[PDB]
Design a protein around this ligand. Sequence first.
Ligand SMILES: *S(=O)(=O)Oc1ccc(C#Cc2ccc3c(c2)C(C)(C)CCN3C(=O)CCC(=O)O)cc1
Length: 138
Amino acid sequence: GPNFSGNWKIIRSENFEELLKVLGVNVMLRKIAVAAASKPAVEIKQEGDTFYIKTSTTVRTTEINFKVGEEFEEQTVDGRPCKSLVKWESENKMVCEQKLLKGEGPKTSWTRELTNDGELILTMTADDVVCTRVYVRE
Ligand SMILES: *S(=O)(=O)Oc1ccc(C#Cc2ccc3c(c2)C(C)(C)CCN3C(=O)CCC(=O)O)cc1
């Protein structure tokens, strides 16, 4: 498949706030999240099926480490600890399902796809809401 490695820059975002709202994030925290996510830095180091992904804004940094096909810990988009599994849906697209570590909640998932034109699309899902974030490589 194509190499996801590099520094990625946001060019288009749909329904990030809508997604946080259906997850019950309060309006003050949603506005901070939308402002922060307006200029993120995404660093991906891909070694075959092994991924390091660092997502940084001024207010929040996540670092995840996963092998496609092995369970790992991360957080949901609204910052709840979860156990995740990634699988390849195609050469170009990984899909991830998240189970909360404690309690129940809505079913959350993400997908990351490297398009034929070099765009990285992240989709994040909860209930009927689909958030799409499109990046280009710096
Ligand atoms: S892309 O890869 O650029 O997409 C992307 C995904 C998520 C984010 C983000 C974010 C974010 C920023 C601030 C906060 C949050 C998320 C929460 C978890 C929803 C809570 C509100 N909030 C804060 O309170 C500040 C940070 C924190 O939780 O400690 C960026 C880019």
